[PDB]
Swiss-Prot record:
This is Y-box-binding protein 2. Found in a mRNP complex with PABPC1 and YBX3. Found in a mRNP complex with ZAR1 and ZAR1L. Residues 1-81 are annotated as: Required for cytoplasmic retention. Expressed in oocytes and testicular germ cells in the stage of spermatogonia to spermatocyte. Also observed placental trophoblasts, as well as in vascular smooth muscle cells in the pulmonary artery, myocardium, and skeletal muscle. Undetectable in epithelial cells in respiratory, gastrointestinal, and urogenital tracts. Up-regulated in various carcinomas and germ cell tumors (at protein level). One of its GO terms (biological process) is oocyte development. It comes from the Eukaryota. Transmembrane segments: none annotated.
Amino acid sequence: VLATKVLGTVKWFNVRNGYGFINRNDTKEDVFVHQTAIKRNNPRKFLRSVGDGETVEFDVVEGEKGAEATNVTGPGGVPVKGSRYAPNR
RNA sequence: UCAUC
């Protein structure tokens, strides 16, 4: 873990490919986010996702190809909103 | 991992 409970804005997230990027609000740098790194998914949606432009809170770790987000939630640990491309329950 | 579901 390189940083804990960092706030960020999802740059974009591709539901079909299962990944995207988050822009850190502190450093304004992008970090990779994989679908499996989402800790609190939207219980009202199917599939694992975050939605473009959403505010998220996460840890930062060193990944294979640059820094990565893990333990992704909404701010204060609440569920994420998820992607418009992820179907609703 | 910069995609364009």
